[PDB]
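dumping this here so i dont lose it again. seq + smiles for B5D
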Amino acid sequence: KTVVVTTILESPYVMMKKNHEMLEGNERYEGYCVDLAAEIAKHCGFKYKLTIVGDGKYGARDADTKIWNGMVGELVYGKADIAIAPLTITLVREEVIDFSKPFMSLGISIMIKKGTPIESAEDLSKQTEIAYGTLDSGSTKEFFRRSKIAVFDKMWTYMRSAEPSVFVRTTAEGVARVRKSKGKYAYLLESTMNEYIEQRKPCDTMKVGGNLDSKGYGIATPKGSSLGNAVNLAVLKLSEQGLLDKLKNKWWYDKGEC
Amino acid sequence: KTVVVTTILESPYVMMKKNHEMLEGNERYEGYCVDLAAEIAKHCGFKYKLTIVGDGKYGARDADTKIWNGMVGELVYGKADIAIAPLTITLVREEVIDFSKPFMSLGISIMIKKGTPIESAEDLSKQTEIAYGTLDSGSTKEFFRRSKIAVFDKMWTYMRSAEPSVFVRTTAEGVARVRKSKGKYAYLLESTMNEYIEQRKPCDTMKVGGNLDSKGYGIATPKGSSLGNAVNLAVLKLSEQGLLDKLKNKWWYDKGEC
Ligand SMILES: C[C@H]1Nc2ccc(Cl)cc2S(=O)(=O)N1
Ligand SMILES: C[C@H]1Nc2ccc(Cl)cc2S(=O)(=O)N1
Ligand SMILES: N[C@@H](CCC(=O)O)C(=O)O
Ligand SMILES: N[C@@H](CCC(=O)O)C(=O)O
Ligand SMILES: [Zn+2]
Ligand SMILES: [Zn+2]
Ligand SMILES: [Zn+2]
């Protein structure tokens, strides 16, 4: 049986190659997670098919319906057998799906347009001239929603009520917003994605401040899956062989443009 | 039933209180892991007893006997129900015990006496004047023994054959050797312990270079233990509420002496 892998279009994790449409199936894609899926499949001994998540979201549970969307929903409702993506390990998710040990570390960070007079989250909260937001249906938004830290709850109170909306449907939308907004929009996103974008043309963005928290991405499977154990061990193996570090250098820093 | 917790005397994770002789049970100890154990037990709803590991080791499997020693041993052989300690998540351990998601990140790092002419593992490997070693029966030694990376295998070949021995039985022994050796000994140990020592008088050592790897400590339980699930969720919860960061600050940097 071929394993259905859910993932998401997110640079440099999963990207359509420049040549694609002349290629077929898995070959259409490239990136850290595409390479990772390959090794994971190799060491676990399964064939697989990469599919881009239908609704284009990471995964959150609807307040009223209690229905999960995104890649999380795909696993929960049996539409996919495994997710291999920049998917954040969190408590509410670990309650409904299984995560491997983390394959990559990250924290919530701030992206600004170069020159923006912001140095920290504290800076954002103490002012109103520069607007800021996060991705919808992801862990960063939930982070601010649930934070008791004074600075972060202040930020959340502002964001949830802002007008026009400060939330974005995709990471690319957030980044495009920062770039087009003359320094009047800052974007809250994970450090991994922030650092990648910083080293890409037009080289007009910048990560400011330290990370707001510390967590990791994990490969996820439906609760009680038979793939769970093998995937976890494979991740540990790849980490100890240095393959994960290798992949990271290949996709972040070998690919620098600035 | 009272949960038997195995841990290890290692600053600032677990230390004897100054007046420990006049105190009882769990009250004899203080430190990061003592604080963490209390929270874990509170959130999981069990009573517990802290016990220091008999042989003072973290855990390695004898090449010949195939017997596990240290904390891993206590778990494998049923002397303890859970280990809460700076116990590194590794593949060979994951095969015989279970680990929660990591509560703290670290990587192997280099400790030098200030002014030592070393900037990297590569630097260490290309020279002989400065000796270097690691702790016995731990993940750091196993990392070098197993590594295929040119630089790390080269270091291992030197270390395994060096005389007198470059290996030490305790972290404190390592640090003292760095301090006593006027620059001629470098010590390979986890970044967390390295960062801690850096902040203690006499302030004569420092961490140089980037980390050689990236991993974390996890709370360990015997394979198929009923505690596994609740402990994992507890770590994520405390992580997300910011407690882990607060504890690190308390024991590392708030008490800073340098
Ligand atoms: C408790 C939580 N903490 C951390 C910290 C760092 C990294 Cl890279 C991974 C994790 S996690 O797997 O999400 N577990
Ligand atoms: C695969 C391995 N990678 C990493 C990376 C960072 C941190 Cl803090 C923890 C881990 S781990 O739990 O050992 N899993
Ligand atoms: N990695 C996040 C998506 C990006 C974000 O939330 O900032 C998640 O798994 O939900
Ligand atoms: N944390 C390590 C011990 C310290 C070291 O090996 O440097 C372990 O679990 O084995
Ligand atoms: Zn491989
Ligand atoms: Zn709804
Ligand atoms: Zn608590």
